[PDB]
Ligand binder design. Structure first.
Ligand SMILES: [Mg+2]
Ligand SMILES: [Mg+2]
Ligand SMILES: [Mg+2]
Ligand SMILES: [Mg+2]
Ligand SMILES: [Mg+2]
Ligand SMILES: [Mg+2]
Ligand SMILES: [Mg+2]
Ligand SMILES: [Mg+2]
Ligand SMILES: [Mg+2]
Ligand SMILES: [Mg+2]
Ligand SMILES: [Mg+2]
Ligand SMILES: [Mg+2]
Ligand SMILES: [Mg+2]
Ligand SMILES: [Mg+2]
Ligand SMILES: [Mg+2]
Ligand SMILES: [Mg+2]
Ligand SMILES: [Mg+2]
Ligand SMILES: [Mg+2]
Ligand SMILES: [Mg+2]
Ligand SMILES: [Mg+2]
Ligand SMILES: [Mg+2]
Ligand SMILES: [Mg+2]
Ligand SMILES: [Mg+2]
Ligand SMILES: [Mg+2]
Ligand SMILES: [Mg+2]
Ligand SMILES: [Mg+2]
Ligand SMILES: [Mg+2]
Ligand SMILES: [Mg+2]
Ligand SMILES: [Mg+2]
Ligand SMILES: [Mg+2]
Ligand SMILES: [Mg+2]
Ligand SMILES: [Mg+2]
Ligand SMILES: [Mg+2]
Ligand SMILES: [Mg+2]
Ligand SMILES: [Mg+2]
Ligand SMILES: [Mg+2]
Ligand SMILES: [Mg+2]
Ligand SMILES: [Mg+2]
Lengths: 138, 56
RNA sequence: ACCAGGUUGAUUCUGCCUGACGUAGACGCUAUUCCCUAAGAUUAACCCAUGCAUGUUUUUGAUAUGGAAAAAUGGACUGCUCA
RNA sequence: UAUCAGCUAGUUGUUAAGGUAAUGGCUUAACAAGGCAAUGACGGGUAACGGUAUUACUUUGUAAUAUUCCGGAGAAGGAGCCUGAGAGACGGCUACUAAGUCUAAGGAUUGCAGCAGGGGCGAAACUUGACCUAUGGAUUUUAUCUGAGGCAGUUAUGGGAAGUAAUAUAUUGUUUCAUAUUGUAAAAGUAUAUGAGGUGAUUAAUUGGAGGGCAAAUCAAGUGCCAGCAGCCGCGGUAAUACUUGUUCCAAGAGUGUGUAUGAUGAUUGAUGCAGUUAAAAAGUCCGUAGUUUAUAUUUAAGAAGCAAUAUGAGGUGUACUGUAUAGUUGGGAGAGAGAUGAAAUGUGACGACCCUGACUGGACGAACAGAAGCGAAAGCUGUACACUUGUAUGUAUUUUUUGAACAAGGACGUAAGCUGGAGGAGCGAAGAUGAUUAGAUACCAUUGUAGUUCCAGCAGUAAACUAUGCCGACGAUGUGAUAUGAUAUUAAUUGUAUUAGAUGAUAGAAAUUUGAGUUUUUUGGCUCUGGGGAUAGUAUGAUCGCAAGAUUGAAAAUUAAAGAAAUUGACGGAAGA
RNA sequence: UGAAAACUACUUGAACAAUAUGUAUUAGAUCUGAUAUGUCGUAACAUGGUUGCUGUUGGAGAACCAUUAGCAGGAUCAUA
RNA sequence: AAUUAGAUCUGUAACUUUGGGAUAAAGAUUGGCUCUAGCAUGCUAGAACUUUUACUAUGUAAGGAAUCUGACUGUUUAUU
RNA sequence: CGGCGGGAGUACUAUGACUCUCUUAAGGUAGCCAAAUGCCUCGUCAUUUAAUUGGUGACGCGCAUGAAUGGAGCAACGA
């Protein structure tokens, strides 16, 4: 298809080959509006229901502490990972949390299986500061 | 049959020693001045950075 | 006008993941000045308490020495939002 | 966007009239059959207001642009109209639908996508403040109005000019304090000057990190696969520079990090500019329309047609004959085992096998010659004689004059099984049933046994259908061969054209290998088809084919740091030789 | 037409019902595949103990067996 | 017992043994008088006027969605 | 013409792919169901209704279903 007067056959052929790009295919179908887990935003809110732990994959061995919540914007149930040592003792049930993502394009990183979200705020108190000990929990 | 009772075992167990107050650290171009004269005396520019700075 | 780490007892390739760097929104911690510049667009073009944003003019002169009405002239511009 | 290929009936045109400020199927009579499409009509989706001033990144240009300015549309949703130079107007009127509010119960009434402000929604966004100072509008705008428009308050939205010390404990003297003038619609604030007091451990610096990428500690104390850290690789088993605390060091600095989109890194979208034998990738093979493209000194090569040698060829189709062997019927002779396995067993024979003989009937197939030899578009093609029919190549003063290459739509052929109908059935033989081996065998071994494999008439369309190498065109190193045929030459040779086998060098390649897989980062002669990390998966769903089995087209949600190609060193073999 | 109130006929036409259809989204008894984490065998890799592998047609707890055609990516580039 | 029913014009689904389902379902029109227009000369289209509005004296299908069983046309206990 | 069994252990509970065992001619395969075929029985779940021993769709250790004594199946047709 190399010719001087072949612009009509060149554009029609190169649009077909571009559809096999795995990043461009999701842009056409619009999957980020259809199958989004959290919506379209940086954070979210929720209500805690359980305080349970999971076990990491081989070859490491530990117990990772998580929490099963229910979102407000959509209404679905989801699990999030408590990201610091000794931080679950602040958390009580029937409370509110704020959820932030991991930063690996919608996948799970580390040896934590099937979980892609982590807690950042409890009762409008920063959990990063509360581990440092600057504030106190009401 | 999963235990969550051992949450926060290590950090509450290690004993706390207090901080030691330090002089007020200089800030600004004088902070860059104290760092430049300290590097020039040990020949840090001549050996092309091949030494240990934090020595303890 | 620049690339690095990861498949093997060791080697050379194809191939992808990750690090380093921009542009718009939200968030954590900490803040002494001065000048410039911005602030309910993203979901709900969803519902509104209260107060205020369009009147001028001897053209005649209200049993009235300067204002009643009637006439004349503009309210179709300007401002707000993106269904 | 083809998992949207046909669509349109006031729709296309002619004549005539009405209506408008005006052209016009803009509306209405009569007549006619037109109008648009693979250069994508007609449909479906948008988390779609169009340009522009302005930002990035760049070797011919891409991406963002609610934000400054120009243009278009709407005032809860729809429709209709008055006044008027200009409204299908909403801080103008009428009706219906969805929401309401006041009442003495007869009735009356409201549109904050105008400025403040409240409610809901959310991860997410400010004073129910003063004023006509400057720029403007309202038919002369020096005094009327102006929530248009200015002037101030709240906020880490960003960009600038700067601070937190300097000279050697001491000296001098920047901010945190106040006051005049200038200024303001009136008040701030900025600038110029002036006052006091005495401090840089001060009123005056934080955020992240210290195994590699990646600048900086094998520093100390606790805990022992626990608690925990880590974008990827990876640390934690009583001496951890890789978790918790404490000391010290590094990077940026009035800022510093965490996170969701979206660009660059990317020569992993390749026009410049990727790859298609073996890593993902050339439809099973030909014919042929739209689109793409072309040898020319404008008159001629090539192409197509046609002769000679009736050269050469398991090319195809149909009638007539023929070859031994296996199996069966039968006439003679004779009288115990025949047949198979590593070794045996069931089965089989005195109603006489097995062997040597004499005659017959049927079905399948052409041994040895038989090759790195021939023909065919591919799948394929070996007994003889005739009939019909067909290729490529070599020679040559034969006709015509550019008729060419490759191909979306369409068409034909296509081993082996498998289907419906009729013919036939010697050997072989899935399924089924028995005898041994075995812990177990429904498998390998052996004995039986049906469909099938044979012929005619049709459907069906899949293979490791492989040279795993699409088709056309120009140039290339020697040596030994093979098929056809012409010239020189003559019994002794060396030479022309078209195919084809192999060896040694030379190039190219990641390498094995290699006359193309060469003429390439010093990348371009023309044209069709296919691939973008593994797995889910050639799986679901829709459409088109088929008597059926099934065939072509062909995703996603949830997952995962590898999967893979060529080649060296070991180890192993119920592998082979010396 | 009518003194007017009003009656009659065309035009634009909001709203309310009955059905046909197009685009999204979502409950459901039962219940198919797939991914992430002990029991019974030994299909594949050496001639993996019956050499492997594609295509079709039948069997079966399970990998998988068996008839027929093909390929070397084989255990042979090779002996009148 | 009641509703539907004749004739003309539009329109017609799931399923399928590809013939059917189907006259599916669902809508609209119908008198009298005076004319115009075709050619086949007794049939069919259109127009104007008018009314206590038109197949209906007699004759004339209620419709749709599912399950069990028999393939269909046919025959049989003269008198339960 | 006819016929087509029973008991024991074995992978937090639970179940038994797998194994052992009495006999016999062979031990109901492909299919189908509380059906005109299911005693207990007005079986269990869903749906139809204000309310259902009725109707329809799923489940199966089926008193006593099952292959020309034919099994599975509804397009056309039915006082
Ligand atoms: Mg990141
Ligand atoms: Mg809005
Ligand atoms: Mg007045
Ligand atoms: Mg919008
Ligand atoms: Mg929009
Ligand atoms: Mg007309
Ligand atoms: Mg724009
Ligand atoms: Mg509103
Ligand atoms: Mg307006
Ligand atoms: Mg308007
Ligand atoms: Mg209006
Ligand atoms: Mg308003
Ligand atoms: Mg407002
Ligand atoms: Mg904000
Ligand atoms: Mg620190
Ligand atoms: Mg270093
Ligand atoms: Mg990190
Ligand atoms: Mg680190
Ligand atoms: Mg590539
Ligand atoms: Mg391979
Ligand atoms: Mg391959
Ligand atoms: Mg022969
Ligand atoms: Mg030849
Ligand atoms: Mg094309
Ligand atoms: Mg084709
Ligand atoms: Mg055919
Ligand atoms: Mg194929
Ligand atoms: Mg192929
Ligand atoms: Mg080929
Ligand atoms: Mg094996
Ligand atoms: Mg084997
Ligand atoms: Mg091999
Ligand atoms: Mg009439
Ligand atoms: Mg009958
Ligand atoms: Mg009787
Ligand atoms: Mg059964
Ligand atoms: Mg039945
Ligand atoms: Mg019931």
């Amino acid at each position: 298809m190399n010719g001087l007067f072949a612009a009509n056959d060149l554009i029609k052929s190169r649009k077909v080959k571009r559809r096999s790009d795995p990043y461009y295919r999701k842009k056409i179908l619009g999957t980020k509006y259809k199958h989004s887990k959290i919506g379209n935003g940086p954070q979210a809110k929720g209500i805690v229901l359980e305080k349970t732990g999971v076990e990491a994959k081989q070859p490491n061995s530990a117990v990772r502490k998580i929490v099963k919540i229910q979102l407000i914007k959509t209404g679905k149930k989801i699990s999030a990972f408590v990201p610091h040592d000794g931080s679950l003792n602040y958390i009580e049930l029937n409370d509110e949390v704020v959820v932030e993502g991991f930063g690996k394009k919608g996948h799970s990183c580390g040896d934590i299986p099937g979980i892609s979200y982590k807690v950042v705020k409890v009762q409008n108190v920063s959990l990063l500061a509360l581990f440092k000990g600057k504030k106190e929990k009401p | 049959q999963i235990n969550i009772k051992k949450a926060g075992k290590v950090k509450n167990q290690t004993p706390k020693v207090a901080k030691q107050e330090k002089q007020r650290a200089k800030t600004g171009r004088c902070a860059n001045r104290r760092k430049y004269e300290a590097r020039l005396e040990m020949g840090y520019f001549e050996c092309n950075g091949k030494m240990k700075l934090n020595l303890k």
